[PDB]
Amino acid sequence: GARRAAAAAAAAGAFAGRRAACGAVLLTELLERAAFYGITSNLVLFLNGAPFCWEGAQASEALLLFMGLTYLGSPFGGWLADARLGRARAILLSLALYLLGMLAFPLLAAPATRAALCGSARLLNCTAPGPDAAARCCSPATFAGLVLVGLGVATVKANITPFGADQVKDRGPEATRRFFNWFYWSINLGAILSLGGIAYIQQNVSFVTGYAIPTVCVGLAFVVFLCGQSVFITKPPDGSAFTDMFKILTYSCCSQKRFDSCKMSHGGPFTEEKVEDVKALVKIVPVFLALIPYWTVYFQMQTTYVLQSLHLRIPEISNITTTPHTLPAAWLTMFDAVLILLLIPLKDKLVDPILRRHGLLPSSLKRIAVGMFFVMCSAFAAGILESKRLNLVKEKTINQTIGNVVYHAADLSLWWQVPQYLLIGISEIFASIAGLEFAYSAAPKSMQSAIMGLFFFFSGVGSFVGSGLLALVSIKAIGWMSSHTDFGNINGCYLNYYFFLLAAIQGATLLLFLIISVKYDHH
Amino acid sequence: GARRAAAAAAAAGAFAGRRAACGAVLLTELLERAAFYGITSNLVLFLNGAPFCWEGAQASEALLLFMGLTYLGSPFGGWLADARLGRARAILLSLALYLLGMLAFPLLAAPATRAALCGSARLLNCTAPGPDAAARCCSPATFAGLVLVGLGVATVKANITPFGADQVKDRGPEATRRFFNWFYWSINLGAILSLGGIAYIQQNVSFVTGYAIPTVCVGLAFVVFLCGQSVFITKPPDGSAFTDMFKILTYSCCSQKRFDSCKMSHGGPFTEEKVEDVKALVKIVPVFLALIPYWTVYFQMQTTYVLQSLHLRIPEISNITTTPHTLPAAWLTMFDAVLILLLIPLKDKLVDPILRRHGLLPSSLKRIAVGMFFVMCSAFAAGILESKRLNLVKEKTINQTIGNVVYHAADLSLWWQVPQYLLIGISEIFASIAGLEFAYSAAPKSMQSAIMGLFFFFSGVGSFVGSGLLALVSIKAIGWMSSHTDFGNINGCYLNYYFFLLAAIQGATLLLFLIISVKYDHH
C-alpha cells in the first residue's frame, strides 16, 4: 500500500518541465478533430443540396467509402511512420496532405471556383426542370479531395497518439494514463467546438464560409506542430532501423511457411528481441478480435440514439431567443461529447487517485470490461425508454421540424434520454482510454504506430459489421426496421427490440472479453 | 497449468471409500427439506380453511413469524452445536424436536384429535352463520408446534451443512465443492418431491393424509441419520473445548471495552490462534453485510415471479388427462427447482472441469459476482416481459382459475417466462454454492457452525428487508402496487417498474460486492 504513495509523485509529477510539448500535441489533436468533424458533419447534405445534385444513396455511399478509407489507411500509415521515416516527419507529411486535399471543398462551395472546376458547370438545381440528368458530378475533384483527406486523417490518427504518449514516457504508466485522459478530453473539446459552431454556420450562414473554417483549423494545426518540432525533442524514434523489424516479422512468418516460433527462432538468426516482439503481436491480435463486437455495438448505439432523439420533444421553447431557423442536426451528436467533457476532469482528478489509493484497478483490461458492462446497462435503459415512447406514440402526434424535414415525435421531453448518455459517457471514459493505453503499452517499442493502426482498423471493421447488422434486421422477414427508407419514421418500426439485441450482444461480449483478458495476463 | 492435472485426482477421487456417509447426509437433507416445504407450502390455506377459521392477515403473520424464527435460531443453533455438544448430537436433538413439534399438525387435521385438542371445539365453518367470533383459535398448540419446528429447522440448517462438508475435508476444496454441488442438488430434489406430491395430495386429497407424509419424512430422516452415526466417524469435532473459544471472543472484545486486537492480544493471554480467529470473524462480517442486498433481491424476485406467472395463460390444455380439480399453486415455485435439477449435473460434470482446466475461477467470491450479474440480467428480462404483458392486458381478458380463485390473465403463454427462470437457475448454481463454500472455508476451524448460522441469519435479514421494500413501494404516493390487497390483481398495478428497480439494486450491489471481494483477498 505504501508503494502507491511512492507512485503518487509520478502522477502529479508527470507534467514535469515538459508541458509545452504536451500542450502542442493536444492543440494539434483538437484542431484536427475539429476539421474532421466539420467535414463529416453535413457532407451528405452538402452534396445533395449542391448544384451537383447527387442522389441520397450516392452521397451516403460517398461518406461510407470515405470513412472506410479512414479506417483502412491507418495500419499503412503506421507502417509508413515506423519505416523509412520518423514519427514527426510522418505527422507533418500527413497533415500537409490533409490540408491539400481538404482545400478543395471550399473552392467547390465558391460559385466562381465551382464553375472553374469540374469542367461541367452543373447547375441543374436539383428539382428545377432538367432534360434528363447525369451521374455524380464533379466526381474527379471531389473523389480526389476525399481520398487525400481520408488518407491524411488515417495517418495522423495512427501516428499522433503514440507520439504524444511516448513524449512523457520518461515517467510511468500513471503519467501515460494522465496524458491519455487529457488527450481524449481535447478530442472531445474539438468535437464539441466543430459540431456546434461549424455546423451552425454551415446550416445557417453559408457553406462557402462554413467549409473555409476547417481549412484554417488544419492550417493552424500544421503551423503549431511545425513550430513545436523544434522544442519537442521528445526522444524522437527516428525510425530508420525500424525498417528491419518489419521485414523480420515475415521471416518469423517464414518459419511458419518453412511456442513453435520461439523454438526455431533461438537456433536461427532470430535474435530473441524479434522473437519477443512477434510473440507479443500474436498475443495482442486476439484482444482486438475480441473487442470487435464492442466496436460494433458502440457505433451502432451511437448512430441509433440520434434517430431516437429526433422523435422526442425538442425543448427550450425551441430556442425562443434568436429563433433557430433550421435547427442543426449536430448538437444531438454533441450531447455525448458534452457529457464526456464534464466527466473526464472529475475522473482524472478524483476517481483515479482514489482507486490507486488502496489497491484497485491497476490494469486496462479490467477497465475495458467495466466500460462494456456500463454499455450494456445503457442499452437496456435505451430499450426501456424507446418501449415507453412506442406505447406513447399511439396517441396524438406533434409535427416538429429539424433541418427542413417534418419529423413526427411523441409528447415526451428529450431530457428523458439523459441516463442513457450518462452511462455512455462513463463507459467511454473507462473503455476508450483504457484501450488506447493498452494498445500503446503492449506493443513492442519498435512498431507502436503499427499496432495503433491495427487497433483503429479493427474499430472500423466493427463499425462496418454493425452497419451490416442494421441492414440485416431491416429485412421484411424480421420487420424491425421496415419503414426506415428515408431520414426516418421510426414511429412505424420497433427500434426497442434492437436496443435489447445490442444489450445481449454486448452482454455476451463482456463474458468473452473477460476470458481472453484473463488468459492474456497469465501469459 | 500442470498442477491443475495434479488436482484432477482430488476432484474425481473426492468420493473415496467413504461414499456411504455422504449418501446418508444427502438423504437426511432431502427428507428434511421435503418436510419443511410440505409444511410451508399451504400453511396459510390450511389455517384459513381449517375449522379454526383465522383471518388472512392472521395466517400471513403466523407464517412470517415462523420463517423469521427459522432465520433467527440459526446462529444460536450453531452456538449450541459448537459448545456443550458435538455436531452429530446437535443434529440428532434438533431433528428430534423437529419431529415432535411437527407431529401436532396432522392431529389438528384429524377431526377427532382436533376436537380433543385446543379445548375449544371451534367448528364455526368460516362463512357459516355464527354469533360473533373469537380470535385465532387453537393458538397454544399451533404456536407451540410452530416454534418447535422452526427452532428445529434452524438448528439443522445451521449444523448439517458444515457437518457434511467436513466429512470429505480429508481431500481438497475441489472435493468440498463437489460435495456442495451435490448437496444443493439433493436440496432441490427434495423441494421438487415435496412441492409436487405433497402439495397435490393436500390441495386435492385431504390435509389429514397430506400432513401425515412430512411427519414420516422427518421420521425417516431421524432414523437414517441415527443409523449412519455408527459409520460416520467423520472426524467428529466432539466440541467440548470449543466452549472456550466462544468465551474468548468476548475477551478479545473485552480488550475493545478495556490491527488493534492483534497488538494487545500478543502481549496478553490471547495465544495467537484466538487472535487469528477473531481477526477472521471481523474480516468475514463485512462480506455477509455486502451480500444482504443480494438476498433481498433474490427473495423478492422469487416471490414476485409467482404472481407474474399467475396472470399468464396456463398451458397444457389445463392438464386435459386427469383434469386438475384445483390446480395446485406450488408447481409455479417448483419451476425453478426443476431448472436447477437439470443444471447442476451439467455444471458439476462439464463446466467445473473445463474451468479448472486452464486457469479460470479458483475463488468463490468471483462466482458470487457472476451469479449476481446473471440475477441482474434475469431481472431486466422479467421487466421487459411484464411490460409486454401489461400492454397486452388492455385488450380482452381470460378468466382462468387456480386454487379456487378466479384470476385474470392475458392471452400470453406461461412458457414465455422460461428465460427468466433459466438465468435465475444459472445465477443460483453459481452464487448459492459459492456462498456456502465460502462460509465453510473462511470460518475458523473451531466455530464453523456459528458462521453458517450467521450466514443464514443475514439471509433472513435480507428477506425481511425485501418484504419491507415491497410494502414501501405499495404506498399510494408511489402507486406501483395499489390494488394488491388480495391474492393478486397485478393487472391494475405496474409490476414491471418493480423488476427494473430490483435490477438497479442488484446492479449497484455487484459493484459494491466486487470492491469488498477485492479487499478481502488482499488481506
Ligand SMILES: CCCCCCCCCCCCCCCCCC(=O)O[C@@H](COC(=O)CCCCCCCCCCCCCCC)COP(=O)(O)OC[C@H](O)CO
Ligand atoms: C458468431 C456470430 C453469430 C451471429 C451474431 C449476429 C447476431 C445474431 C442474432 C440475430 C437476431 C435476429 C432476430 C432475432 C432472432 C429471432 C428471429 C426474430 O426476429 O423473430 C421475429 C419473427 O420473425 C421470424 O420468425 C422470421 C425468421 C427469419 C429467419 C432469420 C432470423 C433467425 C436468426 C438468423 C440469424 C442466426 C441467429 C442465431 C442465434 C444467435 C420477431 O419479430 P416479430 O414478427 O414478432 O416483430 C413484431 C411484429 O410482430 C412484427 O412482425
Ligand SMILES: CCCCCCCCCCCCCCCCCC(=O)O[C@@H](COC(=O)CCCCCCCCCCCCCCC)COP(=O)(O)OC[C@H](O)CO
Ligand atoms: C442505502 C439505502 C438507500 C435506499 C435503498 C432502498 C431503495 C431506494 C430506491 C427507492 C425508489 C422509490 C421509487 C422511485 C424513486 C422516484 C419516485 C417514484 O417512484 O416516482 C413516481 C412518482 O411519484 C412521486 O413523485 C411521489 C414521490 C414520493 C416520495 C417518496 C419516493 C422518493 C424516494 C424515497 C426513497 C429515497 C430514494 C433515494 C434514491 C436512491 C413514479 O411513478 P408514477 O406515478 O409515474 O407511476 C406511473 C403512474 O403515473 C402511476 O402514478
Ligand SMILES: CC(C)CCC[C@@H](C)[C@H]1CC[C@H]2[C@@H]3CC=C4C[C@@H](OC(=O)CCC(=O)O)CC[C@]4(C)[C@H]3CC[C@]12C
Ligand atoms: C458479433 C459477430 C459479428 C461476431 C464477431 C466475430 C467473433 C465471432 C469473434 C470476435 C472475437 C473472436 C475470438 C478472439 C480470439 C480467439 C482466440 C483464438 O485462439 C488463439 O489463442 C489463437 C492462437 C491459436 O490458434 O492457438 C481462437 C479464436 C478466438 C476464440 C476468436 C473466435 C471468434 C471471435 C469470437
Ligand SMILES: CC(C)CCC[C@@H](C)[C@H]1CC[C@H]2[C@@H]3CC=C4C[C@@H](OC(=O)CCC(=O)O)CC[C@]4(C)[C@H]3CC[C@]12C
Ligand atoms: C451501477 C448501478 C447504477 C446499476 C447499473 C444499472 C443501472 C444504471 C440501470 C438499472 C435500471 C435502469 C433504469 C431502468 C428504467 C429507466 C426509466 C427510463 O425512463 C423511461 O423509460 C420513462 C421516463 C418517463 O417518461 O418518466 C429511463 C432510464 C431508466 C432510469 C434506467 C437507467 C439505468 C438504470 C438505473
Ligand SMILES: CC(C)CCC[C@@H](C)[C@H]1CC[C@H]2[C@@H]3CC=C4C[C@@H](OC(=O)CCC(=O)O)CC[C@]4(C)[C@H]3CC[C@]12C
Ligand atoms: C440527472 C439524472 C441523474 C436524473 C435522471 C435524468 C433526468 C434528466 C430526468 C429525471 C426527471 C426528469 C423530468 C421529470 C418529468 C418531466 C415531465 C415531462 O413531461 C411530460 O411527460 C409531458 C410532456 C408535455 O405535456 O409537455 C417532461 C420532462 C420532465 C421535465 C423530465 C426531464 C428529465 C428529468 C429531469
Ligand SMILES: CC(C)CCC[C@@H](C)[C@H]1CC[C@H]2[C@@H]3CC=C4C[C@@H](OC(=O)CCC(=O)O)CC[C@]4(C)[C@H]3CC[C@]12C
Ligand atoms: C473479408 C471477410 C473476412 C469478412 C470481413 C470483412 C468485413 C469488412 C465485411 C464483412 C461484412 C461486411 C458488411 C456486410 C453488409 C454491408 C451492408 C451494406 O449496406 C448497403 O449497401 C445496403 C444499405 C444501404 O444502401 O445503405 C454496406 C456494406 C456492409 C456494411 C459490409 C461492409 C464490409 C463488411 C463488414
Ligand SMILES: CC(C)CCC[C@@H](C)[C@H]1CC[C@H]2[C@@H]3CC=C4C[C@@H](OC(=O)CCC(=O)O)CC[C@]4(C)[C@H]3CC[C@]12C
Ligand atoms: C445472445 C444473443 C446473440 C441472442 C439473443 C438476442 C435476443 C435479445 C433476441 C433473440 C430473439 C429475440 C426475440 C424474438 C421474438 C420476439 C417476438 C416479438 O414480437 C412479439 O412480441 C410477437 C411474437 C409472436 O407473435 O410470436 C417481440 C420481441 C421478441 C421477444 C424478440 C426480442 C429480442 C430477442 C429475445
Ligand SMILES: CC(C)CCC[C@@H](C)[C@H]1CC[C@H]2[C@@H]3CC=C4C[C@@H](OC(=O)CCC(=O)O)CC[C@]4(C)[C@H]3CC[C@]12C
Ligand atoms: C450472457 C449473455 C446471454 C448476455 C446476458 C444478458 C442476456 C441473457 C439478456 C440480454 C437481452 C435479454 C432478452 C431481452 C428481451 C427478451 C424478450 C422477453 O419476451 C418478451 O418480452 C415477449 C416474448 C414474446 O411473447 O415473444 C423474454 C426475455 C428476453 C428474451 C430477454 C432474455 C435475456 C436476454 C437475452
Ligand SMILES: CC(C)CCC[C@@H](C)[C@H]1CC[C@H]2[C@@H]3CC=C4C[C@@H](OC(=O)CCC(=O)O)CC[C@]4(C)[C@H]3CC[C@]12C
Ligand atoms: C451454466 C451454463 C448453461 C452456462 C454456459 C456458459 C458458461 C460456460 C459461462 C457463463 C458465464 C461465464 C463466465 C463469465 C466470466 C468469467 C470471469 C473470468 O474470471 C476471472 O478470471 C476474472 C478475473 C480474476 O479472477 O482475477 C473467467 C471466465 C468466466 C468465469 C466465464 C467462464 C464461462 C462462463 C461460466
Ligand SMILES: CC(C)CCC[C@@H](C)[C@H]1CC[C@H]2[C@@H]3CC=C4C[C@@H](OC(=O)CCC(=O)O)CC[C@]4(C)[C@H]3CC[C@]12C
Ligand atoms: C439495500 C438497502 C436496504 C441497504 C442495505 C444495507 C447497506 C447500506 C449495507 C450492505 C453492505 C454494507 C457495507 C458492508 C461493509 C462495509 C465495510 C465497513 O468497513 C470496514 O471494513 C469495517 C471495519 C472498520 O470500521 O474499519 C464500512 C461499512 C461498509 C462499507 C458497509 C456499509 C453499508 C452497506 C452498504
Ligand SMILES: CC(C)CCC[C@@H](C)[C@H]1CC[C@H]2[C@@H]3CC=C4C[C@@H](OC(=O)CCC(=O)O)CC[C@]4(C)[C@H]3CC[C@]12C
Ligand atoms: C428455450 C430457450 C433457450 C428459448 C427461449 C424460451 C422459449 C421457451 C420460448 C421461445 C419461443 C417461444 C414460443 C414462441 C411462440 C409462441 C406463441 C404464443 O402464442 C401467442 O402469443 C398467442 C396466444 C394464443 O392466442 O393462444 C404461445 C407461446 C409460444 C408457443 C412460445 C412458447 C415459449 C417459447 C418456446
Ligand SMILES: CC(C)CCC[C@@H](C)[C@H]1CC[C@H]2[C@@H]3CC=C4C[C@@H](OC(=O)CCC(=O)O)CC[C@]4(C)[C@H]3CC[C@]12C
Ligand atoms: C434493528 C435495526 C438495525 C434494523 C434492522 C432490523 C431488520 C430485521 C428490520 C429493518 C426493517 C424491518 C422491516 C420493515 C417493515 C416491514 C413490513 C411489515 O409488513 C407489514 O406488516 C405490512 C404488510 C402486511 O400486512 O403484510 C413486515 C415486517 C417488515 C418486513 C420489517 C421486518 C424487520 C426489518 C427487516
Ligand SMILES: CC(C)CCC[C@@H](C)[C@H]1CC[C@H]2[C@@H]3CC=C4C[C@@H](OC(=O)CCC(=O)O)CC[C@]4(C)[C@H]3CC[C@]12C
Ligand atoms: C440505483 C438505484 C438505487 C436507484 C435507481 C432506481 C431506478 C430503477 C428507478 C428510480 C426512479 C425510477 C423512475 C421514476 C419515475 C418514473 C415515471 C413512471 O411513470 C411514468 O412513466 C410517468 C411519469 C410522469 O408522469 O412524470 C415510469 C417509471 C419511472 C421512469 C421510474 C422507473 C424506475 C426508476 C428509474
Ligand SMILES: CC(C)CCC[C@@H](C)[C@H]1CC[C@H]2[C@@H]3CC=C4C[C@@H](OC(=O)CCC(=O)O)CC[C@]4(C)[C@H]3CC[C@]12C
Ligand atoms: C464516473 C463516476 C460518475 C462513477 C462513480 C462511481 C465509481 C466510483 C464506480 C463505478 C464503477 C465502479 C467499479 C466497479 C467494479 C470494480 C471492479 C474491482 O476490480 C477488481 O479488483 C476486480 C478483480 C481484479 O482486478 O482482479 C474494483 C472496484 C471497481 C473498479 C469499481 C470502482 C468504483 C467504480 C469505478
Ligand SMILES: *[C@@H]1O[C@H](CO)[C@@H](O)[C@H](O)[C@H]1NC(C)=O
Ligand atoms: C438555382 O438557380 C439560381 C437562379 O438562377 C442560382 O442562383 C442558383 O445558384 C441555382 N442553385 C444551385 C444549387 O445551383
Ligand SMILES: *[C@@H]1O[C@H](CO)[C@@H](O)[C@H](O)[C@H]1NC(C)=O
Ligand atoms: C362444516 O359443517 C359440516 C357439516 O356439519 C362439518 O362436517 C364440517 O366439518 C364443518 N367444517 C369445518 C371446516 O369445520
